Design a protein around this nucleic acid. Sequence first.
DNA 1: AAGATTAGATTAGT
DNA 2: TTCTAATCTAATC
Lengths: 54, 52
Amino acid sequence: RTAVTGSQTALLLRAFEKDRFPGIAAREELARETGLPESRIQIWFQNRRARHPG
Amino acid sequence: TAVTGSQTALLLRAFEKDRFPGIAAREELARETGLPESRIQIWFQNRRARHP
DNA sequence: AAGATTAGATTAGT
DNA sequence: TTCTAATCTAATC
C-alpha cells in the first residue's frame, strides 16, 4: 500500500539487532509501535534475515 | 556492463517466444550470448517492466 | 536508456 | 504453525 518511513525502518533494525527471530508477541508489539500490520512486520524480518546473514 | 548490439537482437526473439524463461531457458541464453546467467534474468526483469 | 540494486510480497515446501 | 529459498513486482541508484 505504501513505502515505509525512515523512523519505522530505524525501529525495525533496532529490534532486528536484538532479536532476529522475534516471536509472535514481539512482532505484535512492533506492529503497534510502527502502525504497520503484523503480516508486514513478519515479511520484513523474513526478507531482512534472508538478505543480511550473520 | 553494456551489452553488444548482437546480444540484444538475440534476446528479443527469445523474449517474444518465452517472456518468463525458467532457469533452463535462461541458462541456454547465457551460453548463446556469453553473458552471466544473473544478468540475463535481470535483463528480462527490466524488459518486462519497461516493455510489456 | 538501460543495467543494477533494494524493498515488499508471494509461493512451495521436508 | 513458523521458517527458508526463489522469485516476482515496483521503485529507485
